[PDB]
Amino acid sequence: KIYPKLHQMDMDKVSRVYADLRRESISTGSFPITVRHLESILRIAESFAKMRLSEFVSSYDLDRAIKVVVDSFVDAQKVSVRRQLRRSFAIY
Amino acid sequence: KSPGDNIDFQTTILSRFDMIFIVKDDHNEERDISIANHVINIHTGNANA
């Protein structure tokens, strides 16, 4: 029954997050985070909205999706590459 | 490295194809922000449709 959507009001932050993910990733250089990761953030945000029976995706759902994506990407890295967790992506 | 030895298959296979596009990824942020905005417009932005 639940087919959620987003709205342009939540574009800004997501774009910036994508950029940050990219730049800490090439500095590391170990794992490419491409447009596929942005589109996985979007999908997990839709799922987060779905579990709340909401019809629009709130910014907190986007924050949770970003957290899940960055945690999965970080935990798939090396210990040497894992710095992005402590001081790069600690904001998310 | 050259496009050959950077690829799995035989080098001369590049002769068979008429045009070969090397789609390199540019990490410039202007492009990153534009691509993210476009891809969000795709995802429930409904602007592109």
Q: Experimental method for this entry?
A: cryo-EM
Q: How far apart are CA A70 and CA A66, in angstroms?
A: 6
Type and span of the H or E element at A46: helix A35-51
If you count residue pairs, one on A and one on B, with CB atoms under 8 Å apart, how many are there? Answer: 51
β-pair partners for A56: A5
Q: Is A61 helix (H, G, I), strand (E, B) or coil?
A: helix
Nearest-angstrom CA–CA distance, A38 and A55: 21
Find the closest chain A residue to B34 by CA distance. A15
Query: Which tokens go with B13?
Result: 């296979």
The torsion angles phi and psi of A20, rounded to 5 degrees, stand at -60, -45
Query: Do A11 and B25 make contact, defined as CB atoms within 8 angstroms?
Result: no
User: Tokens 């986007």 correspond to what residue?
Assistant: A62
Question: Do the beta carbons of residue A14 and residue B36 sit within 8 Å?
Answer: yes
CB spacing of B39 vs A38 below 8 angstroms: yes
Q: Do B39 and A8 touch (CB under 8 A)?
A: no
End-to-end CA distance of chain B: 41
Four-residue CA torsion sign, B44, A67, A58, A22: negative
